[PDB]
PDB file of C-alpha atoms and ligand atoms in Angstrom:
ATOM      1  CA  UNK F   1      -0.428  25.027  34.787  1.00 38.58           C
ATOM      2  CA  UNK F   2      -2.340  21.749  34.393  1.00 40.33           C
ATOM      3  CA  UNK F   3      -1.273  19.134  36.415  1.00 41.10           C
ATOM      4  CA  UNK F   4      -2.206  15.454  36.280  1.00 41.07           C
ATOM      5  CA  UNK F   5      -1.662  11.946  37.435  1.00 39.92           C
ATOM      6  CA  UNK F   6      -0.402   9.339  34.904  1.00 40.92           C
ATOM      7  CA  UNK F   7       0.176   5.759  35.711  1.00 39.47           C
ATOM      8  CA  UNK F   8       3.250   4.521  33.605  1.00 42.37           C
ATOM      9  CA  UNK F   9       2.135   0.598  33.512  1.00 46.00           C
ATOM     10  CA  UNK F  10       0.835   0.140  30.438  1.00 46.65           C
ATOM     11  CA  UNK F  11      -2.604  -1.833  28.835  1.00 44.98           C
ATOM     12  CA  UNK F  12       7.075  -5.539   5.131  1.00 45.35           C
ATOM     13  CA  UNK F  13       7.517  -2.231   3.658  1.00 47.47           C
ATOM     14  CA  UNK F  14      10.488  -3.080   1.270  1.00 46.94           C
ATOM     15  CA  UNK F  15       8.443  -3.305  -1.723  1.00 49.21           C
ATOM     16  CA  UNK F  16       8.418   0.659  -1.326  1.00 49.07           C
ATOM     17  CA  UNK F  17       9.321   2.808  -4.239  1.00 48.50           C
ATOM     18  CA  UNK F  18      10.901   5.125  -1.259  1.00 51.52           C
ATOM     19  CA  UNK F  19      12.217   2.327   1.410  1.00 54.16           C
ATOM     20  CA  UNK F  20      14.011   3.505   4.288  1.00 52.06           C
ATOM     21  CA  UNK F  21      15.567   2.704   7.403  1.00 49.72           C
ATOM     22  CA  UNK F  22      15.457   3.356  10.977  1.00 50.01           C
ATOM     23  CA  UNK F  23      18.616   5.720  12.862  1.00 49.59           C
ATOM     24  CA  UNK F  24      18.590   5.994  16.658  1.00 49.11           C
ATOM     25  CA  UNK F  25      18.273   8.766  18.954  1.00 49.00           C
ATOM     26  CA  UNK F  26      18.886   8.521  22.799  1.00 48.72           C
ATOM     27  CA  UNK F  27      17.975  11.310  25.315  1.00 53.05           C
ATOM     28  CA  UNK F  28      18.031  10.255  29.153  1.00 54.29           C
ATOM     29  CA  UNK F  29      15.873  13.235  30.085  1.00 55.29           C
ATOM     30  CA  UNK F  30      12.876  12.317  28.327  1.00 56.25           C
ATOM     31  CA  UNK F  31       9.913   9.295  27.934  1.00 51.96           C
ATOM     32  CA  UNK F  32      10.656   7.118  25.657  1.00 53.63           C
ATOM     33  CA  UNK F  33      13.899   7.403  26.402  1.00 55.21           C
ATOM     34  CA  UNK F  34      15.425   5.426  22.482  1.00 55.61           C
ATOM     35  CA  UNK F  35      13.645   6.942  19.369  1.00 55.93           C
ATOM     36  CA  UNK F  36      13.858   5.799  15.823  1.00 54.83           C
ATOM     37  CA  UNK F  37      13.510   7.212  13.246  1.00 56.90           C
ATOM     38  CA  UNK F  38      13.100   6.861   9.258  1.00 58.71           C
ATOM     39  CA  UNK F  39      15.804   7.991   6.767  1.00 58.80           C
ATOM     40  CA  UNK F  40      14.859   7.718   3.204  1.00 59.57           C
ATOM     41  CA  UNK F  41      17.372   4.676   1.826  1.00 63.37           C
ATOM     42  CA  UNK F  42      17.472   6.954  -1.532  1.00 60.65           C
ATOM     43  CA  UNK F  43      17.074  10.539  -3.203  1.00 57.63           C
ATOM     44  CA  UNK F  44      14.990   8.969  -6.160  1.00 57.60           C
ATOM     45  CA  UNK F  45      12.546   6.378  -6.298  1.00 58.90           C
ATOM     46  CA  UNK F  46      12.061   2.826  -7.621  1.00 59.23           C
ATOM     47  CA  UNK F  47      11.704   2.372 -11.895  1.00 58.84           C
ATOM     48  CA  UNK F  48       9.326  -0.835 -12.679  1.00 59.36           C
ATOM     49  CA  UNK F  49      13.076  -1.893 -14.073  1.00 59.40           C
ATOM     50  CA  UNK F  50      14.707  -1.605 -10.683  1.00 58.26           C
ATOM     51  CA  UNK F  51      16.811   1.350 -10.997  1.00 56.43           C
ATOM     52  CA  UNK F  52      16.598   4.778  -9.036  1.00 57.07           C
ATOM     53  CA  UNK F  53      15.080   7.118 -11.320  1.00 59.21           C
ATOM     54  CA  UNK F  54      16.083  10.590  -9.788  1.00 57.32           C
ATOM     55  CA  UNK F  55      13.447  12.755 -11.671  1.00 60.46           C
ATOM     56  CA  UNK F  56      11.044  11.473  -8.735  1.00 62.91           C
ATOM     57  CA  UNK F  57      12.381  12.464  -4.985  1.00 62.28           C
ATOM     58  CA  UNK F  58      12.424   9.899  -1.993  1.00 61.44           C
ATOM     59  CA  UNK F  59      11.285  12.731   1.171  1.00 61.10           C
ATOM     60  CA  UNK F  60      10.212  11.693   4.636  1.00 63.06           C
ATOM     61  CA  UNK F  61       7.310  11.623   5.906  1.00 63.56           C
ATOM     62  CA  UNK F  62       7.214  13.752   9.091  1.00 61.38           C
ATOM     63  CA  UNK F  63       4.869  13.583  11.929  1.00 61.97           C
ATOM     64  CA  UNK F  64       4.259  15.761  14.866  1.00 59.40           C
ATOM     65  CA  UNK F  65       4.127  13.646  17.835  1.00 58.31           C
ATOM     66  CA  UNK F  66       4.457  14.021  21.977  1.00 59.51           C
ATOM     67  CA  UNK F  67       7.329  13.074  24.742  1.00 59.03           C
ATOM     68  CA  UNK F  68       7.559  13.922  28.103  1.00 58.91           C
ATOM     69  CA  UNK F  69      10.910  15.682  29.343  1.00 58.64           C
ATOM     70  CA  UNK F  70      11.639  16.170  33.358  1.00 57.99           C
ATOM     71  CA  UNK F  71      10.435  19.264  34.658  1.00 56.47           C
ATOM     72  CA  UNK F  72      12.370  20.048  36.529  1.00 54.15           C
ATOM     73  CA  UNK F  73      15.448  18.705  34.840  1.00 59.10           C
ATOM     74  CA  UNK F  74      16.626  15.056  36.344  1.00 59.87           C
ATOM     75  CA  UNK F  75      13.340  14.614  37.924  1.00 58.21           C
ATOM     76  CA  UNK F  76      11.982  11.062  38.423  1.00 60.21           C
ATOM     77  CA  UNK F  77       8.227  11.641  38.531  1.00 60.40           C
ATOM     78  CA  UNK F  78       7.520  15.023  36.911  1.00 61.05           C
ATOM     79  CA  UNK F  79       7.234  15.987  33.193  1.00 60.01           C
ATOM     80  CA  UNK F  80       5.976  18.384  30.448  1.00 58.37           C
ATOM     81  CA  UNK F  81       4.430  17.493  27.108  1.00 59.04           C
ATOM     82  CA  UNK F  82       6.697  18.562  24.061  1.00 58.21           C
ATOM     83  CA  UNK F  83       5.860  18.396  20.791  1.00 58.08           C
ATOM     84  CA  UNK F  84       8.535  17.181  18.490  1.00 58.35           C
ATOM     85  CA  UNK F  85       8.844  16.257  14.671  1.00 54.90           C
ATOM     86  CA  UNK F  86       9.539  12.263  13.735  1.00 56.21           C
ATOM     87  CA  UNK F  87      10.053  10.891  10.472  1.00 53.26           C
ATOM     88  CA  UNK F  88       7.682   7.620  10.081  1.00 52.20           C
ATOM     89  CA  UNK F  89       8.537   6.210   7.033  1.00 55.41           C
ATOM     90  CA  UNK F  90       9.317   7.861   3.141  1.00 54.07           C
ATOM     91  CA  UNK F  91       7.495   8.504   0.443  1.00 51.39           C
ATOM     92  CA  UNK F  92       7.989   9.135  -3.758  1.00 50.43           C
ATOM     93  CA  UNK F  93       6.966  12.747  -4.908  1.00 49.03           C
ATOM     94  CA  UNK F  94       6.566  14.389  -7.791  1.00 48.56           C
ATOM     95  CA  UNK F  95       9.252  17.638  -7.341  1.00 47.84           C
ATOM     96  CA  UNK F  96       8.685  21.612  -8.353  1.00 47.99           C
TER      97      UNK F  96
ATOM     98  CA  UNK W   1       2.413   0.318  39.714  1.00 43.54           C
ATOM     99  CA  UNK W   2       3.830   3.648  39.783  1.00 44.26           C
ATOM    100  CA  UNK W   3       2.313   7.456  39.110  1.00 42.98           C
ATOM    101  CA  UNK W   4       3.796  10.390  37.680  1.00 44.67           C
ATOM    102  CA  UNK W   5       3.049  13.971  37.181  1.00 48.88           C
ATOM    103  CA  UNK W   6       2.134  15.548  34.134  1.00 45.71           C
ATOM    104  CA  UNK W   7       2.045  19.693  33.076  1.00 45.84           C
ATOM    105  CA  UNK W   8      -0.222  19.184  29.893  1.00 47.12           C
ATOM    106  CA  UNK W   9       0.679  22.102  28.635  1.00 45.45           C
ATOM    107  CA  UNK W  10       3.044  21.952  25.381  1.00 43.17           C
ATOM    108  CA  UNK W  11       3.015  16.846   0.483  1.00 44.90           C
ATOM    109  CA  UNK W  12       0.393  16.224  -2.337  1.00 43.41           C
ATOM    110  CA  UNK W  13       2.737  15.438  -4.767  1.00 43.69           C
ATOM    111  CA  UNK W  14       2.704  11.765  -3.711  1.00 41.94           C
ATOM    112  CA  UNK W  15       2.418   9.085  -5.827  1.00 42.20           C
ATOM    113  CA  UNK W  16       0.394   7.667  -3.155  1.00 42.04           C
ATOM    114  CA  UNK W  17      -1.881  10.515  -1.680  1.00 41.20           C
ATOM    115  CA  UNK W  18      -3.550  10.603   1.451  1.00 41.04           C
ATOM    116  CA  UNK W  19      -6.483  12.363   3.340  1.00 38.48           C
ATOM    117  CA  UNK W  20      -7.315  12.870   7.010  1.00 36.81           C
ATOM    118  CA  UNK W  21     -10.183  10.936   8.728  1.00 36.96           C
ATOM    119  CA  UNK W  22     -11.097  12.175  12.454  1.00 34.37           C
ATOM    120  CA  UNK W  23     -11.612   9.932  15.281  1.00 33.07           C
ATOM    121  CA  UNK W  24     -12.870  11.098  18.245  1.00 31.66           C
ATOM    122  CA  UNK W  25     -13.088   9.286  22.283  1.00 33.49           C
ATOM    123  CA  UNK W  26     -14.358  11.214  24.675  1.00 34.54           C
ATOM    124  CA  UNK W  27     -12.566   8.648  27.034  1.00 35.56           C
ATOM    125  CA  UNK W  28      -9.283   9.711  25.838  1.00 36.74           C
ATOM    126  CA  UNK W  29      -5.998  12.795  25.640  1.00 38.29           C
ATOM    127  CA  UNK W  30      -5.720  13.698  23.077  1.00 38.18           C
ATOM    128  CA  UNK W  31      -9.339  12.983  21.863  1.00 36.48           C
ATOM    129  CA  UNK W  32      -8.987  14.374  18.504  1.00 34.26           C
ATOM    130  CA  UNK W  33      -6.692  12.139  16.129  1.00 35.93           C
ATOM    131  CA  UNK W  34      -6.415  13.405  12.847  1.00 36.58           C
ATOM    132  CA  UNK W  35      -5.315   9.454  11.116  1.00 37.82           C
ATOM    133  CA  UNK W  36      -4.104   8.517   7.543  1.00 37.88           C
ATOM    134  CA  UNK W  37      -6.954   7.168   4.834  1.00 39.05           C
ATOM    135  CA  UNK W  38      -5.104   6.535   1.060  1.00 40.61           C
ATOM    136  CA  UNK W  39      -6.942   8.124  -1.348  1.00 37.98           C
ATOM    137  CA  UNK W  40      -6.455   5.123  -3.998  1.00 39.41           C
ATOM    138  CA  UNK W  41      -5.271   1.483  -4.115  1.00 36.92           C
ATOM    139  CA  UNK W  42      -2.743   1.894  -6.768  1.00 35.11           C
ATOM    140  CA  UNK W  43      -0.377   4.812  -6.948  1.00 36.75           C
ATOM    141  CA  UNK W  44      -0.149   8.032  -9.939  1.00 38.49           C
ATOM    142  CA  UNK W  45       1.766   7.618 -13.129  1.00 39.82           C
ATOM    143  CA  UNK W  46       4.041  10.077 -14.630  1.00 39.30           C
ATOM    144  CA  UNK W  47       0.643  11.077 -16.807  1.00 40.96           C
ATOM    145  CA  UNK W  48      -1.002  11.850 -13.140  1.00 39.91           C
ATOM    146  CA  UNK W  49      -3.436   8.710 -13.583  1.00 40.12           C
ATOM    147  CA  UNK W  50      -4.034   5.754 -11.825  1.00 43.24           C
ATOM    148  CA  UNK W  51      -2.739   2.373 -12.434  1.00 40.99           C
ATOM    149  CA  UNK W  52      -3.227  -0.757 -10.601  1.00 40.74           C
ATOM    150  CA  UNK W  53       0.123  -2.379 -11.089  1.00 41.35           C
ATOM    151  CA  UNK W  54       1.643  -0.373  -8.011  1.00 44.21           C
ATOM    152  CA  UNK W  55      -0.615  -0.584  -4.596  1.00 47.16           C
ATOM    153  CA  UNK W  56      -0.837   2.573  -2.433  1.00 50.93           C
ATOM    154  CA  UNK W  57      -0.389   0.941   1.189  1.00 50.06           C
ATOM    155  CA  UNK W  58      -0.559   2.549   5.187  1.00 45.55           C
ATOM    156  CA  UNK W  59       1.835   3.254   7.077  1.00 46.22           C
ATOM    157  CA  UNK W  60       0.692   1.687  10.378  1.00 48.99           C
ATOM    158  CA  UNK W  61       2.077   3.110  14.038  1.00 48.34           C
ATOM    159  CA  UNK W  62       1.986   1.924  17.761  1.00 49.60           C
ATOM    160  CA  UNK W  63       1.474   4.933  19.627  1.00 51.16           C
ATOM    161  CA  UNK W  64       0.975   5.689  23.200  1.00 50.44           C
ATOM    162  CA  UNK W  65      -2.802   7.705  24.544  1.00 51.86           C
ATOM    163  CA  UNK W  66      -3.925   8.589  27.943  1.00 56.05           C
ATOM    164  CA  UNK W  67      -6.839   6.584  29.082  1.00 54.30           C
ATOM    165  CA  UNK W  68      -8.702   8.252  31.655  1.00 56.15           C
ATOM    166  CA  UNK W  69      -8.482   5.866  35.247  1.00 55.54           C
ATOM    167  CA  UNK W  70     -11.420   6.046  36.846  1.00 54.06           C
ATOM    168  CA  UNK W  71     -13.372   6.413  33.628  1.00 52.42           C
ATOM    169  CA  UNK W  72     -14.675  10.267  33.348  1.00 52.81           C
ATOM    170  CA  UNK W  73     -11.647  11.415  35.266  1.00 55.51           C
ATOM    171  CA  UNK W  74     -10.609  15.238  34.721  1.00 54.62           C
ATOM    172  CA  UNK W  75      -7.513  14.477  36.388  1.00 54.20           C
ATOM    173  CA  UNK W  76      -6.032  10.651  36.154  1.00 55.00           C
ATOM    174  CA  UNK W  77      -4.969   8.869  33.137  1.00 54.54           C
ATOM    175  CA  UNK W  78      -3.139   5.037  32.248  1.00 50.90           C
ATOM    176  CA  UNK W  79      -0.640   4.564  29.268  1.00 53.45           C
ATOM    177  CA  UNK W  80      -2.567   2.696  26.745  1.00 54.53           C
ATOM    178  CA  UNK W  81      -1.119   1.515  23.397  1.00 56.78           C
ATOM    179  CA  UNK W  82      -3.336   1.703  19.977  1.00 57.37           C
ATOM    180  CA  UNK W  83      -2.130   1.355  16.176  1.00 56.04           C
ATOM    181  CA  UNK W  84      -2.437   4.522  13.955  1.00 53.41           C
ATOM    182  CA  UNK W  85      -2.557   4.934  10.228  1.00 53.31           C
ATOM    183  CA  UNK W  86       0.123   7.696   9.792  1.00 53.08           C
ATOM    184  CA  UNK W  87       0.780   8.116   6.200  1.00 53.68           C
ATOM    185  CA  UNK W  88       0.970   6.539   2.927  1.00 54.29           C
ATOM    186  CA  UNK W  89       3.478   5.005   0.911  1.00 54.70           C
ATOM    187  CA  UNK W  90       3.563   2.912  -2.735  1.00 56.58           C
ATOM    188  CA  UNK W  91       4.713  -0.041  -2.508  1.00 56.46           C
ATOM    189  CA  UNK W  92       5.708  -3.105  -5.534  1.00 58.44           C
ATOM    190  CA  UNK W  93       3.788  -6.587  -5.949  1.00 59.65           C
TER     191      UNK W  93
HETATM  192  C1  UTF D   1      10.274   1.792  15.905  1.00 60.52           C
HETATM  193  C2  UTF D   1      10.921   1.981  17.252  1.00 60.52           C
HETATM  194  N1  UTF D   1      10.026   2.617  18.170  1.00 60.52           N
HETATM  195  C3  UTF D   1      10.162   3.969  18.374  1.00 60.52           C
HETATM  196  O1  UTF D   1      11.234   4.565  18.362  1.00 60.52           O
HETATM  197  C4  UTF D   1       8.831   4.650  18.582  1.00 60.52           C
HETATM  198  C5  UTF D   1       9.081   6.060  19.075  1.00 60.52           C
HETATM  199  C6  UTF D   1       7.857   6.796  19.536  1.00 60.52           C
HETATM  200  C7  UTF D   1       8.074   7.803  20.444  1.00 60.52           C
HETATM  201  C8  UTF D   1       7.031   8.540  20.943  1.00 60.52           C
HETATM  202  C9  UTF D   1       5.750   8.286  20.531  1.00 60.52           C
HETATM  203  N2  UTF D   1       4.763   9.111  21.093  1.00 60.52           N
HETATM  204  C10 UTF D   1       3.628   8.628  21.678  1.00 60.52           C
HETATM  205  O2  UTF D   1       3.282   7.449  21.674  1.00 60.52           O
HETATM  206  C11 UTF D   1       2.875   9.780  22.303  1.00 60.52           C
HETATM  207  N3  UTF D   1       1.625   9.929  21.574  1.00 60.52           N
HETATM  208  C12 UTF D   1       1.286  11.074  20.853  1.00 60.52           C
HETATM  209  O3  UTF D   1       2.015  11.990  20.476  1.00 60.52           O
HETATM  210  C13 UTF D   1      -0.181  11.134  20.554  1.00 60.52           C
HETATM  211  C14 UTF D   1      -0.448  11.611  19.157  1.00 60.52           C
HETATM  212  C15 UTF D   1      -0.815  10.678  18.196  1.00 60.52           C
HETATM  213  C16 UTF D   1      -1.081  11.038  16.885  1.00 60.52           C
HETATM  214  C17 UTF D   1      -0.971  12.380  16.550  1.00 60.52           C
HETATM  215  C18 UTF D   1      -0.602  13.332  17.502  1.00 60.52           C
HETATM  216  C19 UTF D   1      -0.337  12.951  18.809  1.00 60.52           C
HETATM  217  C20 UTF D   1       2.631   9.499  23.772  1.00 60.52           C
HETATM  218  C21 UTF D   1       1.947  10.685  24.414  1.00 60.52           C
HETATM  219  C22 UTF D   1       1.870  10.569  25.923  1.00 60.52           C
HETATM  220  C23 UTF D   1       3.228  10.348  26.546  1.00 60.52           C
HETATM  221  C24 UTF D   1       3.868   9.104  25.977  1.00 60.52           C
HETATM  222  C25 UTF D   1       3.939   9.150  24.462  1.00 60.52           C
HETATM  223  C26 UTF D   1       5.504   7.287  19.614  1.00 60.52           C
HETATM  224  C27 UTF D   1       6.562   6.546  19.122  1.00 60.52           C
HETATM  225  N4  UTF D   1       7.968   3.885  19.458  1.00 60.52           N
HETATM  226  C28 UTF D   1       8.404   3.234  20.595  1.00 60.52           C
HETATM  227  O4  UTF D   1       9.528   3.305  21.083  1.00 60.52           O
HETATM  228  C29 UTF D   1       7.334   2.382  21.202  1.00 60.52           C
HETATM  229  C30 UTF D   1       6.591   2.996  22.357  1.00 60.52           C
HETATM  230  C31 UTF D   1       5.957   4.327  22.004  1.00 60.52           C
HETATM  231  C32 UTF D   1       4.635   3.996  21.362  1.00 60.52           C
HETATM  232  C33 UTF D   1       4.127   2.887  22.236  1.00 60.52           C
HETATM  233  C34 UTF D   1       5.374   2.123  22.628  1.00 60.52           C
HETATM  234  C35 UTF D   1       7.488   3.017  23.575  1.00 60.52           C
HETATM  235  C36 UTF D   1       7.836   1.663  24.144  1.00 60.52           C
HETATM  236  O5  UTF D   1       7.224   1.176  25.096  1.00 60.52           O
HETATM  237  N5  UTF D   1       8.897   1.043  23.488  1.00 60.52           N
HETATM  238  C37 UTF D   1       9.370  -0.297  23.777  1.00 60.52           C
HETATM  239  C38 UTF D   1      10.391  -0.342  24.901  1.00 60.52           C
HETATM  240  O6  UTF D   1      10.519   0.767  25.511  1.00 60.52           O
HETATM  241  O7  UTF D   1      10.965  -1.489  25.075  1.00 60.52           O
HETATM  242  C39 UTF D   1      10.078  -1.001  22.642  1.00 60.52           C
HETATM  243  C40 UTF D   1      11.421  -0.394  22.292  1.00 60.52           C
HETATM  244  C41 UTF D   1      12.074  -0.952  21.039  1.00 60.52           C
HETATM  245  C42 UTF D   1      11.356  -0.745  19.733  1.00 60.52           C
HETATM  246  N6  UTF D   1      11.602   0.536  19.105  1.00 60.52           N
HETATM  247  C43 UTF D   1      11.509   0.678  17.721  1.00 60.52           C
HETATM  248  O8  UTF D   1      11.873  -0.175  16.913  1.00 60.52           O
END
């Protein structure tokens, strides 16, 4: 394995044709411990009239992104890197 | 102050495209960040052109990066907190 040392101190979007919000997800056994992330506010997008036009498709915008969760489990100074998936924000596509 | 241990071992269709730009500090894990560039400044019509009366905007991120502490450390790192350009969205004026 590869082992390191990390110090842990450290160093609008509603004009969208696909606007979202943010929904919360808590797990104690990993760093950060509160993530948010986006859900699309809508399954179309936005006319130039204001209405949802559902021939266009609001879809997330999913990242890959790091954590760290205790190794071993419950562990107050010892971690992996795991890659997880996190939606960032939404945007309008065209569909199939 | 306090240290840790760390095992480091683990689309097109939008109206308002993207690309990838690299950037690249040797100084820094992960090193290679693959970052969010929009391709235009307004977003794609239902004829697939471009019109100016919608902008294509960033989605901007605070993320977390391992600095290494000493400087050219193999082995010892600090939290350190940068923005990111993650995506792109269009967005009304
Ligand atoms: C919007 C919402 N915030 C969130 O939910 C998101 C979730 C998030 C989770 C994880 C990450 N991953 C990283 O950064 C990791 N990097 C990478 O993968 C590198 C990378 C980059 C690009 C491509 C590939 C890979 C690092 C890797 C090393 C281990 C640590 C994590 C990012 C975001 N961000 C926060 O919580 C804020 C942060 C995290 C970013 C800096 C500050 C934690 C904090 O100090 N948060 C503050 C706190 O704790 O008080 C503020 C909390 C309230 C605000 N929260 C909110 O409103």
């Amino acid at each position: 394995p590869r082992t390191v040392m990390v110090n842990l101190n450290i160093h609008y979007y509603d004009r969208s044709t696909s606007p979202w919000n943010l929904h919360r997800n808590e797990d104690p056994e990993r760093y950060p411990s509160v993530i948010w992330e986006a859900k699309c506010r809508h399954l179309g997008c936005i006319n130039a009239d204001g209405n949802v036009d559902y021939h266009m498709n609001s879809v997330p915008i999913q990242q890959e992104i790091l954590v760290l969760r205790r190794e071993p489990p419950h562990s107050p100074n010892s971690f992996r890197l795991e890659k997880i998936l996190v939606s960032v924000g939404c945007t309008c596509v065209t569909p199939i």
